[PDB]
């Protein structure tokens, strides 16, 4: 069997070079020398080194996924689409996604509700169109309805009177019946149940 001479460290810190019986052999990343417990001295049999570069594939592409995560907040689904995206092998996709939310480094119920927030200080979306934005994203309907809880009638109402009065003078060319019913029609397609327009109406 094949017998480790040395193992020195990459330039870059992470990832090590394996020398067997005094040559280069192969690189592995952290995890995997941990891994495979591998150290000046240890034997190697093909089946192991085959062993070694698979796992090396995917710790490669958890530490991609750990760059990707570094740029701005991501989705389940972000990631998923992400491993995809870099043709990684699908029996990795799932380990990694395990591993990434052992970390806790992905976490959808704080991405819906931070979701919700941002919605709620820069758009005039209602509760219909963010929970339909939030399935799409792939995200549970527990975790759609807790963040839709800051969707109170008093952050509704404000944001339909907002939006009724930027419809009533979209469409102010319109003869009175037909002109309230567009922005009757305009808040329910924003996701805004009925009882809301009943309740804005006078203003």
Not at 110 to 139: C, E, F, W
Not at 151 to 159: D, G, H, I, K, R
Request: proline letters at 3%; charged letters at 30%.
């Amino acid at each position: 069997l094949a017998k480790i001479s040395k193992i020195e460290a990459q330039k870059r810190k992470g990832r090590y070079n394996i020398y067997l019986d005094g040559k280069y052999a192969f690189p592995v990343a952290e995890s995997v020398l941990i891994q495979f417990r591998l150290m000046k001295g240890t034997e190697l049999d093909e089946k192991q080194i085959a062993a070694i570069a698979t796992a090396d594939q995917q710790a490669k592409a958890y530490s991609r996924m750990l760059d990707y995560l570094s740029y701005q907040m991501r989705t389940e689904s972000d990631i998923v689409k992400k491993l995809k995206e870099i043709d990684t092998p699908e029996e990795f996709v799932e380990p990694i996604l395990k591993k990434l939310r052992g970390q806790q480094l992905i976490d959808d119920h704080a991405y819906a509700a931070s979701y919700v927030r941002t919605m709620i200080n820069t758009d005039l979306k209602g509760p219909g169109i963010i929970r339909q934005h939030l399935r799409q994203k792939g995200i549970g309907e527990s975790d759609i309805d807790d963040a839709l809880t800051q969707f109170t009638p008093e952050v509704q109402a404000e944001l339909a009177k907002k939006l009724a009065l930027k419809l009533f003078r979209r469409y102010r060319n319109q003869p009175e019946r037909r002109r309230e019913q567009k922005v009757q029609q305009g808040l329910t397609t924003k996701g805004f149940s009925s009882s809301v327009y009943e309740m804005i109406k006078d203003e």
